Each structure stands twice: as structure tokens, then as C-alpha cells.
């Protein structure tokens, strides 16, 4: 429940975000955990603004694969994963 463990949960598809293929397996994996382990509001809050703070952390990011995630992996995340998510209004 803290950006240590969402950056952990998500490292198999740094590649992908970076413009390589994907996402992996391994990827969708690591997203649909971190789906599941944020079951209220609170922790989904938490997990968008790691993941936005992240987004902005990682060179060369290539804003079409990063935004691709969920949709790509079945994952119902609530916004779209980009160094600029609107936190403040999920659900
Ligand atoms: C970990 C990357 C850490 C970057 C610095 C974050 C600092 C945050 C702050 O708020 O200051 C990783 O390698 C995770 C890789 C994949 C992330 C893919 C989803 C987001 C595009
Ligand atoms: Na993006
Ligand atoms: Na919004
Ligand atoms: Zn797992
Ligand atoms: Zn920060
Ligand atoms: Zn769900």
C-alpha cells in the first residue's frame, strides 16, 4: 500500500512503457495483483498517484504503451496510467 510495492508490482513492464513490445505476461500479472490489492477508495487513490509520480520518474516513456496497460491486460483500472492522471476523481 505504498509506492515501494506498486513500483515493485509493475517493474515487469517497464520495458513496455519504454516503447519495447508488451505487455508482457509477467506485465498484466503485476497490474491485475495491484487491481486486486486495491479494493476501497483510499488505496485506489494511493496506487493512482504512485503510479502517476512513477510515470514521471522513467526516461524515454512512451505515453501510448503506458496508457495501453489495463486495456491490453483485462485490467479494470479506473483512469488512464500517464504522468498526468487526474487522481482526485475515481469513481
Ligand atoms: C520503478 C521506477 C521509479 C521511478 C521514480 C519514481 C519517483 C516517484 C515520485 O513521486 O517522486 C519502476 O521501475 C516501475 C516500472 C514500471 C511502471 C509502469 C507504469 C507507469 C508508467
Ligand atoms: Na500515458
Ligand atoms: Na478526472
Ligand atoms: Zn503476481
Ligand atoms: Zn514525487
Ligand atoms: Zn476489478
Do not use: F
Amino acid at each position: 500500500l505504498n509506492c515501494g510495492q506498486v513500483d515493485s508490482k509493475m517493474k515487469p513492464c517497464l520495458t513496455y512503457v519504454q516503447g519495447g513490445p508488451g505487455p508482457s505476461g509477467e506485465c498484466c500479472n503485476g497490474v491485475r495483483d495491484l487491481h486486486n490489492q486495491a479494493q476501497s477508495s483510499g488505496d485506489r487513490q494511493t496506487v493512482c498517484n504512485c503510479l502517476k509520480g512513477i510515470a514521471r520518474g522513467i526516461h524515454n516513456l512512451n505515453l501510448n504503451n503506458a496508457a495501453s496497460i489495463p486495456s491490453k491486460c483485462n485490467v479494470n483500472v479506473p483512469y488512464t496510467i500517464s504522468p498526468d492522471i487526474d487522481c482526485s476523481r475515481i469513481y
